[PDB]
Amino acid sequence: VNSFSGYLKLTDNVYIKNADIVEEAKKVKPTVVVNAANVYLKHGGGVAGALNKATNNAMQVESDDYIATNGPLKVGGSCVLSGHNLAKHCLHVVGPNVNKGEDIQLLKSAYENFNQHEVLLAPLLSAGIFGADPIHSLRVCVDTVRTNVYLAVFDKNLYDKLVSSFL
Numbered sequence: 359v360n361s362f363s364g365y366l367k368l369t370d371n372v373y374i375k376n377a378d379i380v381e382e383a384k385k386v387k388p389t390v391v392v393n394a395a396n397v398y399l400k401h402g403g404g405v406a407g408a409l410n411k412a413t414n415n416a417m418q419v420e421s422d423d424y425i426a427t428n429g430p431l432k433v434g435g436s437c438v439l440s441g442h443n444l445a446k447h448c449l450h451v452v453g454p455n456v457n458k459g460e461d462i463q464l465l466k467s468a469y470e471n472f473n474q475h476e477v478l479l480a481p482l483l484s485a486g487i488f489g490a491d492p493i494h495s496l497r498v499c500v501d502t503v504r505t506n507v508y509l510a511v512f513d514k515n516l517y518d519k520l521v522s523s524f525l
């Protein structure tokens with residue numbers, strides 16, 4: 359039993375809710391919150407900008423030190439950093455950004471990072487400003503992640519569409 363509430367069950371291991379991931383994280387304080395990161399960990403907008411703002415920019419300060427030491431992530435890759443006031447840990451995962459021309463096949467590789475964590479609160483990778491079809495992203499999630507994933511979908515209209523079209 360865990361503290362996630364109000365989720366709809368899609369499969370054995372995937373759950374979905376219409377929620378603001380920042381507010382969901384603030385209340386649950388999950389072990390892992392997933393950030394929709396880019397390779398530079400520049401948290402300007404979308405989910406990343408919102409998570410970073412909720413940390414009062416501490417996420418960005420930590421991220422800048424990470425990049426200065428290690429260089430950029432790979433598209434499809436990830437790193438574990440602090441969850442600050444939102445979670446124990448933040449798993450920064452880089453899905454492909456269609457608005458930059460990155461290969462959508464890398465979306466499966468991005469979701470594979472979730473399998474290193476038993477339970478996660480996460481957004482749909484490559485959705486929103488990353489330009490992928492969120493319905494495709496949900497399908498890849500269900501077909502790739504084997505650990506327990508709680509998906510927060512900010513837009514109520516999108517949420518209804520994802521549920522109603524789910525196979």
Ligand SMILES: CC(C)[C@@H](CNC(=O)C1(C)CCC1)Nc1ncnc2[nH]cnc12
Nearest residue numbers: 378379380404405408411481510511512
């Ligand atoms: C749109 C909601 C309110 C947003 C949370 N907004 C905010 O924190 C602020 C306005 C930014 C300073 C406060 N969160 C998400 N933004 C994008 N994509 C998502 N997917 C799941 N949640 C989200």
